[PDB]
Amino acid sequence: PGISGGGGGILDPEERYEHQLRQLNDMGFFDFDRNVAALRRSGGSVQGALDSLLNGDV
Amino acid sequence: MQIFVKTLTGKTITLEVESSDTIDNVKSKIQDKEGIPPDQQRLIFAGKQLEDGRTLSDYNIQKESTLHLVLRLRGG
């Protein structure tokens, strides 16, 4: 419990991280939902998300 | 044969190799284009982190393939 916080449309991960989402896709990760769930825990790091995607943490 | 290498920042490099070049040998070419030391960088293809002692043929790399590079210190 106690996870997440406030925000709005301008702050959703699909536009908060749109560069990193493209960089993950362009390396080979077309699973948008996994990339989002990985960037959400990595703090928006491309390689931090990539490590989670490789390990199957998403 | 040629290949391309793309940073985590978003720059695309282009290099001249053979299917018998190693991952080590590929990193060592980017040092001619940007100066990035081949012990700091790593390479990525199909999302998989590539091993230094492997070839381009080992990952079925083709001519004009669009790979990525990863610095152990980020650099951006």
UniProtKB/Swiss-Prot annotation, chain A:
Domain UBA, chain residue ranges per copy: 13-56
Protein name in UniProt: Ubiquitin domain-containing protein DSK2
Localization: Nucleus
Transmembrane segments: none
Gene that this sequence comes from: DSK2
Highest taxon in the source lineage: Eukaryota
Other known facts: Present with 3930 molecules/cell in log phase SD medium.
Purpose: Involved, with RAD23 in spindle pole body duplication. Involved in the ubiquitin-proteasome proteolytic pathway.
Swiss-Prot record, chain B:
Localization, UniProt: Cytoplasm; Nucleus
Domain of life: Eukaryota
Linked residues for Glycyl lysine isopeptide (Gly-Lys) (interchain with K-? in acceptor proteins): G76
Sequence ranges assigned to domain Ubiquitin-like in this UniProt record: 1-76
Membrane-spanning parts: none
Function, as annotated: Exists either covalently attached to another protein, or free (unanchored). When covalently bound, it is conjugated to target proteins via an isopeptide bond either as a monomer (monoubiquitin), a polymer linked via different Lys residues of the ubiquitin (polyubiquitin chains) or a linear polymer linked via the initiator Met of the ubiquitin (linear polyubiquitin chains).
The protein's name: Ubiquitin
Species, as recorded: Saccharomyces cerevisiae (strain ATCC 204508 / S288c) (Baker's yeast)
Gene for this chain: RPL40A
Residues included from the entire protein: 1 to 76 of 128
